[PDB]
From Swiss-Prot, chain B:
Annotated gene: NAN1
Organism: Saccharomyces cerevisiae (strain ATCC 204508 / S288c)
Name of the protein described by the UniProt record: NET1-associated nuclear protein 1
Superkingdom: Eukaryota
Localization (cell): Nucleus, Nucleolus
Leader sequence segment: none
Subunit organization: Interacts with snoRNA U3. Interacts with MPP10. Component of the ribosomal small subunit (SSU) processome composed of at least 40 protein subunits and snoRNA U3. In the absence of snoRNA3, forms a complex with other t-UTPs. This complex can associate with pre-18S ribosomal RNAs.
Note in the entry: Present with 6560 molecules/cell in log phase SD medium.
S-S pairs: none
Full-sequence portion shown in this chain: 9 to 249 of 896
Function: Involved in nucleolar processing of pre-18S ribosomal RNA. Required for optimal pre-ribosomal RNA transcription by RNA polymerase I together with a subset of U3 proteins required for transcription (t-UTPs).
UniProtKB/Swiss-Prot annotation, chain C:
PANTHER family according to UniProt: U3 SMALL NUCLEOLAR RNA-ASSOCIATED PROTEIN 15 HOMOLOG, UTP15 U3 SMALL NUCLEOLAR RNA-ASSOCIATED PROTEIN 15 FAMILY MEMBER
Something else known: Present with 358 molecules/cell in log phase SD medium.
Subcellular location: Nucleus, Nucleolus
Superkingdom of origin: Eukaryota
Keyword tRNA processing: no
Segments annotated as WD repeats: 36-77, 78-117, 123-161, 165-205, 209-246, 249-293
Keyword set, alphabetical order: Nucleus, Repeat, Ribonucleoprotein, Ribosome biogenesis, rRNA processing, Transcription, WD repeat
Native source organism of the sequence: Saccharomyces cerevisiae (strain ATCC 204508 / S288c) (Baker's yeast)
GO CC annotation, single: small-subunit processome
Known partners and oligomeric status: Interacts with snoRNA U3. Interacts with MPP10. Component of the ribosomal small subunit (SSU) processome composed of at least 40 protein subunits and snoRNA U3. In the absence of snoRNA3, forms a complex with other t-UTPs. This complex can associate with pre-18S ribosomal RNAs.
Protein's UniProt name: U3 small nucleolar RNA-associated protein 15
Classification via InterPro entries: U3_snoRNA-assocProt_15_C, WD40/YVTN_repeat-like_dom_sf, WD40_repeat_CS, WD40_repeat_dom_sf, WD40_rpt
Swiss-Prot record, chain D:
Chief localisation class: nucleus
Keywords (A to Z) from UniProt: Nucleus, Repeat, Ribonucleoprotein, Ribosome biogenesis, rRNA processing, Transcription, WD repeat
Repeat region (WD), residues: 12-43, 44-83, 171-210, 212-247, 319-351, 389-429
InterPro entries per UniProt: SSU_processome_Utp12, U3_snoRNA-assoc_WDR, WD40/YVTN_repeat-like_dom_sf, WD40_repeat_dom_sf
Subunit architecture: Interacts with snoRNA U3. Interacts with MPP10. Component of the ribosomal small subunit (SSU) processome composed of at least 40 protein subunits and snoRNA U3. In the absence of snoRNA3, forms a complex with other t-UTPs. This complex can associate with pre-18S ribosomal RNAs.
Localization per Swiss-Prot or TrEMBL: Nucleus, Nucleolus
Listed GO CC annotations: nucleolus; nucleoplasm; rDNA heterochromatin; small-subunit processome; t-UTP complex
Name assigned to this protein: U3 small nucleolar RNA-associated protein 5
Protein's GO biological process: maturation of SSU-rRNA; maturation of SSU-rRNA from tricistronic rRNA transcript (SSU-rRNA, 5.8S rRNA, LSU-rRNA); positive regulation of transcription by RNA polymerase I
Family to which the UniProt record says this protein belongs: Belongs to the UTP5 family.
Gene3D superfamilies cross-referenced by the UniProt entry: YVTN repeat-like/Quinoprotein amine dehydrogenase
Annotated function: Involved in nucleolar processing of pre-18S ribosomal RNA. Required for optimal pre-ribosomal RNA transcription by RNA polymerase I together with a subset of U3 proteins required for transcription (t-UTPs).
Name of the gene encoding the protein in the UniProt record: UTP5
Note: Present with 33100 molecules/cell in log phase SD medium.
From Swiss-Prot, chain E:
Shown segment, full-protein numbering: 271 to 594 of 594
Single GO biological process annotation from the record: endonucleolytic cleavage to generate mature 5'-end of SSU-rRNA from (SSU-rRNA, 5.8S rRNA, LSU-rRNA)
Subunit structure: Interacts with snoRNA U3. Interacts with MPP10, UTP21 and UTP25. Component of the ribosomal small subunit (SSU) processome composed of at least 40 protein subunits and snoRNA U3.
WD repeat start and end residues: 20-57, 186-227, 236-277, 283-316
Keywords per UniProt: Nucleus, Phosphoprotein, Repeat, Ribonucleoprotein, Ribosome biogenesis, rRNA processing, WD repeat
Protein name, entry field: U3 small nucleolar RNA-associated protein 18
Chief subcellular location: nucleus
Subcellular locations according to the entry: Nucleus, Nucleolus
Extra remark beyond the main annotation: Present with 9570 molecules/cell in log phase SD medium.
Length: 486, 233, 493, 475, 317
């Protein structure tokens, strides 16, 4: 149990336990009334109205093991309806940040700790943050441009937010999970909800592309496969809830991750298509059927590479002629008309097989002339009309091993009209690397011609994008959203 | 050309540092059940309880004293621990708010309109051990403070009075207890309960519960969880 | 607070020939009833105005059937020999029949006891007779004399027009709904000619060749026509004067063909063709006459028809076989003191100021497995998952839902062999299925890993296991042969 | 109408209205500029307010009531300060005031003059040949107060120091309701239940003109210098006459007309509007008693006009917490699929005794029943002979049919597992020549791929099986 | 439909008109909190399990009580209920309560503002009616009494100041099957008070029933008798008794029958004398079905089957 409260009379007991239920214990006959589904476990409860009219309660939202996602709720005693709900944005971090501690439960699980377990986990987390160098905390964040709407792909859910008024407008489930259909109990805590790893929108904005991976319960023979699912939905501007239209089971075959996703622009098919890159180099292009209300596999390039490395990315030429593919230690340019190599009859050494030192993290074209590629050790800016390199800078002193693959892809972005803006993170240390992080955001333009502006921030920043209002949006470890703009 | 500024705030300022009180819902409703005051990590939001939307915002960065006190770029030690509806100094003004942070600060501000950029700032005395909680019956105030010397924590209880001078915050030093594992205070704010390990030292059972009245000494009772517990457990 | 999410049924990956809204609709064409006549039924035609009735030709006999009743409504037997053609007028009053005497009889519907008009065509037996569509008072006929005759009601004794220019055995002619003067005519030589009545007429405006004997000409659209003869059928366009398409997907010579448009359906327009097998096939001009549906009736069908667009009710589709079998597939569509004491509930609130409603709709009724799983009685939910009388797919869905939300162990702690077998009977029933084999493997593996020695103690479960081993070795062979299939397909690609 | 009496203040900033509630009359003052829940109740259900006059230092109202007395009532103090009684139990019939002088007609046909500063009855008074009277006014003769007007269906001008009548205007058939001096020598009289206002010239004792309303005239007001006169009309409207004192010229019609209509069509009446130069103020009853106000510019507004006002006529009670349907707003909406189509990543789209003649016929006309009956057989020599004497493309579409039937009924695939083998064996070269192998065997590929994917877990199951098998066979 | 009107002689006009869907209006009452004096709630129930509470301008604030924190098995519906004050008597806080019938004896007592299940008292046999009495104890304090009448004629007096305990018993002399009960003469439901000091013990008590009697007792002597004799046994209504209401000053008692047209009698007290001059034959009253007095002005409101409500005034007051 987590919260015990008494009525002003002393004849009612407000109890809130681990499972997402609120119990009214009427003491005399020892009866009870239940609120069974509250979108998160309930830490605390309290009565406010002098006659006992309002029930306030603090909710933990512990599904996000990285971020203890808090929420405040206020109930009419009359109808037991959620009179008031406040909730900040809920990012999904790659690790617990500063002091987020799993709440006390019977047994230490992936979402809970015992008591000796609580102390050991505290010491372990402190030692991990002191020792390790892999502090990424990079979170996928999307922006619907048609509404300037922030989208946080929470664990088996999506939080639709609006930074203009700093409020959460929506919380939508997408997976066939048991998040709200049922609580979670002592032994079932080891069972985890599906992780919707990927979410973006088409340039049209009407369609949202989602990729998730399924986790079967442990201690089973089939407890090894990670089922990969794609989904396309639709919402209009007159509603705020997406409706699923198309649902795809295990694309590119079984147990193959589809890590890299890229939408299509409005130029090619009015942005009704998508491209998917695997670690096996497979690139599948779907698009929406004209007569029929689903998509289909319009085009496919299906290599079969024995090795596997999820360090895969792709960029799209603004006219749709060619596709850059950053694969571990290799750059490719694929013609779109047939999914074959970029063959030039003139043979002016504008080849499509470029070797690079490390695994390629990002490849982004600022226009049809300038391409910036960020590999796990460095960054290089090159021309496209002529195969001539212009700029180069290092990531070994700073981006040495802090991140895994794709984190650079989700961090760094590019605006088609002001240039490129990058991110770097440091931490002040006093004699041990102190937890106090201190990062920099740097604005460039035209394949790093010069630094438009470097700005240091005294705390960590975990995500950067650009709202199409020509204003780049950055996040903090705490759910604070700031902007650099003109 | 390019300027940086914080826009949206999330995490409400939960007093997670205490971790001993079962009543850490600190955001409070007004004297009139019309609006709700909620302190975040970076601002304080006021909502009309019926329209449900934000009717007032109090951003620390935009404020001067709030920026200089709560928006320290080096330490996050100071966070709001209590909000109080009535003004501490003036008897029955209406749209006043008193704020107590982690470190003995008394901030008097006005919601429901334009926030004056000159808040009534005060600092309490004996701000050596931390401020854990504050509350009040009529007139007299009571402060719980977290004091330290086995990874356990002592709690010192003082009585707060004021209106002698603008800075004179008189502390009575009511009482003190040691190594409290868990503690809580009644909704009336007239009683508190807590446990300890002195009985663990003096017996086999690891804790005993003591309940104490605040503004009176009617209820002062200690008893063992050994007496409480059962043979089966 | 939130609501309880409804159970999410698990949808399988799409199987080939997915049930389109079309295929579904051509499946709700239902209620196929067979009736017997005494010769080969020749022609069938619905009544345009009030589509509630249709006329069928037979041996010296013309029968009017209803739509809701589907019974012989009207009887025509005043013929001497077998009738050949039957056609209604645009006004839905006069039906005209071409007989084997070379004299057609047209008279009002619902009055068989009157021969409202008997027009003598050529001495050779008359074959096909039709009304105008746009015009109310002109008739067209074709007989064995290889000449078509245009007739006005006023001159019943002399043909208003004598259209000629054919080769041999004129057997079909049709009117264009757009031009109230243009006419098409198909003879035994294919080669459908195109005449104008307002011109001289004796020479066609132009002809389009159907080499094999064309037996039907249908103006499907104001610009396109279909020539339906022989094995194949060619859809031509008049403005281009050339065949837009042609389909030869029929088995024997196509015997009948009709068209329906702008009616209550997922498909906007449909084209039916019966090809002497009971084989009726439904194409659609909007899909370039692509195969959409088909029925097969044993007797070789001679005529087919469909209820018109405005049937205002149950839809009908008839196939008359040469044996004389009409197959009709139909798709079907407290006292005064007490009233005074509760006489206000019907208000519905139209005039007052403020309207408020907090009603919640009654959802679909909740099944036993869903109920048991939601109130967490897991072993009972398993037992309901292995009750006999229910669907394999439903059992599949409940199995995955159970294994996902809960753990199969807790669903499977304390069974006896007597409640153990039904699980395994479902296993032996469905392991051969592709969709569930992995799940059944999971469940059988955990059940054995729990009940190892009880397998020994219980004798029957041992031979259940034995047959399970035999069938799973059979599936081993199937899967390995499938891997060999992988091999030579990868070779051939 | 629920408003018993109403009266504006000078400058048109406030109005006081007396209305009844459970048979006790309450007076209430309101501001008309943009509530005031303060009222004043009457203790006795039987005494009612008859005349009601504004007075501008504390702002006060004068209430001539049934009892026969005058209540001077200060509004800001919200209290009746003074009570002027007279020597009678009658009902005062009409009141008027100027400076410190107050004058009134009591229905006993008795004139009374009172002094406010001395709080005293200056003089009782009576006059001959005034038998019924219900209105009086006192001319704006400067500070002099002589020659005041009285009226009941016959307007009579009377001098006070001469204490006798002077001139007699023909009044109306009905008792006079409104009587107001616009300017010197010109005044308006408007009867009860009538549509005609008489514009009388005094010194002539003659009729200057007449104004015709559209219906019965309920109430009247006018601007300073006879430029504007607005009359509230009983069926509820505002008719304004503009410059009514200048040249079939005797009777003047309304110059402009103003109505108030709700959104849905219902017409809200008006009552006691006020006019100032280039500003018209309009009052109406919003709820059953609550009065609402508006201001407007009659000069700019056209000659006929309809003030629209929004009422919740058939309003839907929208609550912040209930969504558009079913659920609460804070309820995180769950996940549903509906009729969403499912498709995998391997389904490619937009990418002797033989039976040969029967196979070819069925494939040319894909009869499902015939194809089932002809695939029922399982004789391998016949399979080989057929596929040897079968067409290549016909065998290709045959393979597609086999694929779809294995998908529909995987149980049928047992004997059907060799049909595809013989097809590939005897027509491999045609498949090499065809360009789109995936496009022509996608269904086959899906079936065999899922079978191969089934393979390994199946073999693991076999190992677990024969493990426990041998285990309990030996024990 | 809830319609609220504003009341005069010549002009009663529609102040507001709310429309519920699928929730018939079987009972609906005003209510004011005594402490704050600014709640002004409206409570309504019908042949359903949910009762709507409307607070007191263009959108409505309406809640619905549908969950009984103890048990839903004691009552099939909310069609009948009443509202009353209640003092905590430990903390001198005064608040509304809601009173409900059940199936057999069950009487549910809920907190009005909060919807809690405060307590319950079970009366035996079949519940037919109950009523609310107040009793000032000292200055600033009172206690509330719930009177319940069983069909046979038994009357059970509970107090609610302390939790539900029978104060006493007594049986009505006669009244084989009672239909309605009603106390009156002081502060009550139809005559609410406006502060603590204004509560006065009722004086008269009426027990009315379908074979047409109304037994009228005086509290001052029934309380000591415990087997009381009615001060009068009125019989002027031949038919079922369906509405018994006292005047705000406890001098007039109205008896109304639902069955027959023109079925209202007024009785002057303590004379126990039916008023003779009213209603006359030509008193357009209809099949009376709802009656209520005015708080002060002696008005009388009576609504009939045809939907019309008529309003007289008792000129004396």
């Amino acid at each position: 149990v987590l919260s015990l409260s008494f009525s002003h009379d002393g004849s009612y007991l407000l109890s809130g336990g681990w499972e997402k239920v609120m119990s009214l214990w009427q003491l005399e006959t020892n009866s009870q009334q239940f609120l069974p589904r509250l979108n998160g476990i309930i830490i605390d409860c309290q009565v406010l109205g002098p006659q006992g009219n309002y029930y306030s309660l603090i909710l933990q939202m512990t599904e996000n093991n990285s971020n203890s996602d808090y929420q405040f709720l206020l109930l009419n005693a009359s109808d037991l309806t959620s009179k008031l709900s406040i909730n900040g944005p809920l990012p999904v971090f790659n690790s617990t940040i500063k002091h987020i501690q799993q709440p006390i439960s019977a047994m230490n699980t992936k979402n809970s700790n015992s008591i000796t377990s609580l102390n050991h986990s505290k010491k372990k987390q402190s030692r991990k943050l002191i020792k390790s160098r892999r502090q990424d905390f990079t979170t996928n964040v999307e922006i619907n441009p048609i509404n300037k709407n922030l989208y946080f792909p929470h664990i088996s859910a999506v939080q639709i937010f609006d930074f203009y008024k700093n409020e959460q407008v929506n919380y939508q489930y997408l997976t066939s999970g048991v998040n709200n259909s049922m609580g979670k109990v002592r032994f079932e805590l080891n069972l985890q909800d599906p992780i919707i790893t990927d979410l973006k929108f088409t340039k049209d904005g009407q369609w949202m592309i989602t990729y998730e991976i399924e986790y079967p319960p442990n201690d089973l023979l089939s407890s090894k496969d990670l089922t990969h699912i794609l989904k396309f939905w639709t919402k209009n501007d007159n509603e705020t809830n997406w409706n699923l239209k198309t649902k795809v089971i295990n694309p590119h075959g079984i147990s193959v991750p589809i890590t890299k996703i890229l939408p299509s622009p409005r130029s090619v098919n009015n942005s009704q298509g998508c491209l998917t890159a695997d670690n096996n180099g497979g690139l599948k292009f779907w698009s929406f059927d004209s007569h029929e209300s689903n998509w289909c596999l319009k085009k496919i390039s299906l290599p079969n590479f024995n090795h596997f490395s999820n360090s895969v990315s792709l960029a799209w030429s603004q006219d749709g002629s060619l596709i850059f593919h950053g694969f571990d230690d290799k750059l490719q340019i694929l013609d779109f008309d047939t999914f074959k190599k970029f063959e030039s009859l003139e043979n002016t050494k504008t080849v499509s097989e470029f070797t690079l030192d490390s695994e390629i993290q990002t490849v982004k074209l600022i226009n049809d002339t300038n391409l910036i590629v960020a590999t796990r050790t460095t960054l290089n800016a090159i021309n496209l009309l002529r195969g001539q390199v212009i700029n180069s800078f290092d990531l070994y002193p700073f981006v040495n091993g802090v991140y895994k693959n794709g984190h650079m892809d989700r961090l760094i972005t590019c605006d088609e009209r002001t240039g490129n803006i990058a991110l770097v993170i440091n931490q002040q240390l006093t004699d041990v690397p102190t937890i106090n992080y201190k990062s920099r955001i740097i604005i460039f333009d035209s394949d790093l011609s010069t630094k438009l502006g470097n700005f240091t921030h005294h705390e960590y920043i975990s995500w950067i994008g650009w709202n199409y209002d020509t204003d780049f949006i950055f996040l903090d470890i705490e759910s604070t959203l700031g902007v650099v703009g003109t | 050309q390019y300027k940086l500024s914080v826009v949206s705030g999330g995490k409400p300022a939960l007093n997670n540092l205490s971790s001993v009180t079962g009543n850490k819902n600190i955001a409070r409703l007004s004297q009139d059940q019309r609006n709700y005051i909620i302190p975040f990590n970076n601002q304080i939001k006021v909502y009309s309880v019926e329209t449900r939307q934000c009717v007032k915002t109090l951003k620390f960065a935009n404020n001067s004293l709030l920026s200089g006190i709560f928006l320290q770029e080096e330490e996050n030690n100071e966070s709001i621990v209590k909000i109080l509806l009535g003004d501490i100094t003036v008897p029955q003004q209406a749209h006043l708010i008193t704020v107590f942070t982690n470190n003995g600060h008394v901030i008097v501000l006005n919601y429901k309109g334009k926030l004056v950029e000159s808040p009534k700032h005060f600092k309490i005395s004996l701000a050596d051990e931390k401020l854990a909680n504050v509350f009040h019956s009529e007139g007299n105030y009571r402060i719980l403070t977290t004091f330290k010397d086995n990874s356990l924590q002592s709690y010192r209880l003082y009585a707060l009075t004021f209106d002698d001078a603008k800075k004179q915050f008189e502390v009575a030093h009511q009482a003190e207890w040691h190594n409290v594992i868990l503690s809580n205070i009644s909704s009336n704010g007239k009683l508190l309960a807590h446990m300890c390990k002195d009985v663990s030292t003096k017996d086999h059972e690891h804790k005993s519960i003591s309940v104490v009245s605040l503004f009176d000494d009617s209820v002062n009772l200690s008893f063992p969880l050994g007496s409480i517990l059962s043979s089966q457990t | 607070s939130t609501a309880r999410p409804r159970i999410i049924t698990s949808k399988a990956p799409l199987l080939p020939q997915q049930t389109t809204p079309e295929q579904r609709y051509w499946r709700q064409y239902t209620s196929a009833q067979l009736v017997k006549e005494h010769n080969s039924v020749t022609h069938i035609s619905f009544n345009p105005q009030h589509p509630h009735d249709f006329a069928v030709t037979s041996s010296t006999r013309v029968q009017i059937f209803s739509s809701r009743t589907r019974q012989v409504i009207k009887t025509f037997s005043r013929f001497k020999d077998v009738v050949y053609s039957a056609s209604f007028r645009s006004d839905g009053k006069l039906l005209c029949a071409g007989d084997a005497t070379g004299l057609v009889s047209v008279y009002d519907s619902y009055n068989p006891r009157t021969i409202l008009l008997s027009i003598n065509a050529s001495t050779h037996p008359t074959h096909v007779t039709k009304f105008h569509t746009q015009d109310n008072k002109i008739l067209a006929t074709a007989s064995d004399d290889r000449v078509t005759r245009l007739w006005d009601i006023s001159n019943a004794y002399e043909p208003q027009l004598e259209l000629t220019g054919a080769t041999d055995y004129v057997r079909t002619l049709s009117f264009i709904p757009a031009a109230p003067h243009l006419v098409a005519t198909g003879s035994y030589d294919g080669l459908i000619r195109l005449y104008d009545t307002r011109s001289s007429g004796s020479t066609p405006i132009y002809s389009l060749n159907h080499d094999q004997p064309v037996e039907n000409v249908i103006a499907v659209s104001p610009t396109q026509i279909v020539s339906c003869g022989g094995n194949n059928f060619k859809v031509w366009d008049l403005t281009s004067n050339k065949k837009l398409y042609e389909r030869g997907n029929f088995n024997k010579a196509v015997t009948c063909l009709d068209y329906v448009e702008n009616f209550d359906s997922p498909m906007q327009s449909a084209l039916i063709a019966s090809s002497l097998d009971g084989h009726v096939k439904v194409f659609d001009p909007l899909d370039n006459f692509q195969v959409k549906f088909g029925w097969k009736f044993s007797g070789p069908v001679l005529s087919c028809a469909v209820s018109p667009s405005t049937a205002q009710g149950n839809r009908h589709l008839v196939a008359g076989l040469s044996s004389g079998l009409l197959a009709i597939r139909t798709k079907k569509k407290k006292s005064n003191n007490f009233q005074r004491m509760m006489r206000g509930s019907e208000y519905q609130g139209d005039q007052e100021h403020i309207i408020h409603n907090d009603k919640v709709r009654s959802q679909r009724r909740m099944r036993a497995f869903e109920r048991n799983i939601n109130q967490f009685k897991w072993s009972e939910a398993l037992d309901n998952a292995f009750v006999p009388g229910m669907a394999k797919e439903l059992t599949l869905t409940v199995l995955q839902e159970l294994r996902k939300r809960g753990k199969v162990r807790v669903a499977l702690y304390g069974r006896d062999e007597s409640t153990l077998e039904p699980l395994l009977n479902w296993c032996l029933k469905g392991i051969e299925d592709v969709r569930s084999a992995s799940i059944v493997a999971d469940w059988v593996a955990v059940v054995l890993e729990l009940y190892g020695n009880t397998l020994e103690s219980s004798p029957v479960l041992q031979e259940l296991m034995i047959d399970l081993k035999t069938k799973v070795r059979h599936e081993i062979h199937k899967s390995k042969e499938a891997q060999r299939i992988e091999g030579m397909l990868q070779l051939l690609t | 109408s629920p408003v018993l009496q109403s009266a504006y203040d000078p400058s048109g900033q406030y109005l006081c209205y007396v209305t009844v509630a459970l048979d006790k009359q309450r007076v209430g003052v309101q501001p008309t500029q943009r509530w005031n829940e303060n009222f004043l109740y009457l203790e006795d259900s039987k005494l009612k307010v008859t005349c009601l006059k504004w007075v501008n230092d504390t702002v006060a109202i004068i209430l001539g009531m049934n009892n026969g007395e005058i209540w001077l009532y200060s509004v800001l103090a919200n209290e009746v300060t003074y009570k002027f009684t007279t020597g009678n139990s009658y009902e005062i019939k009409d009141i008027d005031l100027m400076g410190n002088q107050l004058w009134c007609i009591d229905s006993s046909d008795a004139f009374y003059q009172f002094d406010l500063l001395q709080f005293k009855l200056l003089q009782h008074f009576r006059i001959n040949n005034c038998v019924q009277l219900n209105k009086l006014t006192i001319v704006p003769a400067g500070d002099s107060v002589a020659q005041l007007l009285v009226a009941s269906h016959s307007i009579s001008l009377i001098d006070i120091e001469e204490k006798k009548v002077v001139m007699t205007f023909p009044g109306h058939v009905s008792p006079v309701s409104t009587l107001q001096v616009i300017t010197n020598e010109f005044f308006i009289s408007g009867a009860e239940g009538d549509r005609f206002l008489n514009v009388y010239d005094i010194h002539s004792g003659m009729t200057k003109c007449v104004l015709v309303a559209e219906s019965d005239i309920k109430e009247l007001s006018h601007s300073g210098q006879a430029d504007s006169i607005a009359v509230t009309t009983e069926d509820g409207s505002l008719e304004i006459f503009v410059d009514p004192l200048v040249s079939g010229n005797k009777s003047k019609k309304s110059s402009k007309k103003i109505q108030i209509v709700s959104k849905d069509g219902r017409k809200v009446p008006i009552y006691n509007a006020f006019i100032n130069k280039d500003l018209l103020n309009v009052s109406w009853l919003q709820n059953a008693t609550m009065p609402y106000f508006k201001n407007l510019q009659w000069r700019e507004i056209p000659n006929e006009y309809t003030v629209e006002i929004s009422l919740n006529w058939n309003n839907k009670n929208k609550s912040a917490d209930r969504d558009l349907h079913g659920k609460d707003l804070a309820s995180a909406t769950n996940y549903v699929e509906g009729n969403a189509r499912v498709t995998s990543g391997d389904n490619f789209k937009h990418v002797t005794g033989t039976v040969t003649v029967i196979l070819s016929q069925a494939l040319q006309s894909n009869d499902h029943s015939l194809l089932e009956t002809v695939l029922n057989n399982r004789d391998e020599r016949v399979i080989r002979d057929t596929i040897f004497r079968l067409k290549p493309a016909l065998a290709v579409i045959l393979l597609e049919r086999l694929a779809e039937r294995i998908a529909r009924q995987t149980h049928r695939q047992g004997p059907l597992n060799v049909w595809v083998k013989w097809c590939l064996i005897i027509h491999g070269g045609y498949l090499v020549s065809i360009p789109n192998l995936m496009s022509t065997l996608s269904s086959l590929h899906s079936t065999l791929k899922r079978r191969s994917d089934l393979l390994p877990r199946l073999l693991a199951l076999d190992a677990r099986l024969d493990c426990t098998i041998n285990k309990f066979k030996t024990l | 439909t809830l319609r609220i009107y504003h009341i005069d002689g010549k002009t009663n006009h529609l102040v507001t008109s709310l429309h519920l869907v699928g929730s018939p209006i079987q009972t609906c009452t005003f209510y004011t909190s005594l402490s704050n004096q600014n709640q002004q709630n409206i409570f309504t129930a019908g042949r359903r399990r949910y009762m709507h509470s409307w607070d007191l301008s263009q959108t409505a604030k309406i809640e619905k009580f549908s969950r009984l924190y103890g048990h839903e098995s004691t009552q099939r519906s909310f069609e009948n209920f009443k509202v009353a004050h209640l003092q905590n008597s430990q903390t001198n806080s005064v608040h509304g309560i809601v009173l409900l019938q059940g199936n057999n004896g069950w009487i549910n007592i809920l907190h009005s503002t909060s919807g809690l299940w405060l307590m319950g008292c079970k009366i035996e046999g079949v519940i037919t009616d109950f009523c609310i009495d107040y009793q000032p104890i000292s200055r600033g304090k009172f206690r509330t009494i719930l009177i319940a009448v069983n069909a046979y004629g038994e009357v059970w007096e509970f107090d609610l100041n302390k939790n539900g305990h029978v104060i006493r018993r007594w049986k009505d002399q006669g009244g084989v099957g009672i239909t309605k009960i009603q106390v009156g003469g002081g502060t009550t439901t139809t005559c609410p008070a406006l502060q603590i000091s204004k509560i006065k013990q009722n004086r008269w008590l009426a027990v009315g029933s379908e074979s047409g009697f109304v037994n009228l007792y005086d509290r001052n002597n029934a309380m000591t008798s415990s087997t009381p004799t009615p001060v009068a046994a009125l019989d002027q209504l031949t038919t079922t008794i369906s509405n018994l209401q006292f005047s705000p000053d406890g001098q007039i008692l109205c008896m109304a029958s639902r069955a027959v047209k023109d079925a209202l009698r007024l009785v002057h007290l303590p004379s126990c004398s039916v008023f003779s001059n009213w209603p006359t034959s030509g008193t357009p009253l209809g099949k009376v079905t709802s009656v209520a007095f005015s708080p002060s002005g002696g008005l009388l409101a009576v609504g009939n089957e045809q939907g019309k409500v008529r309003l007289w005034k008792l000129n004396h007051y």
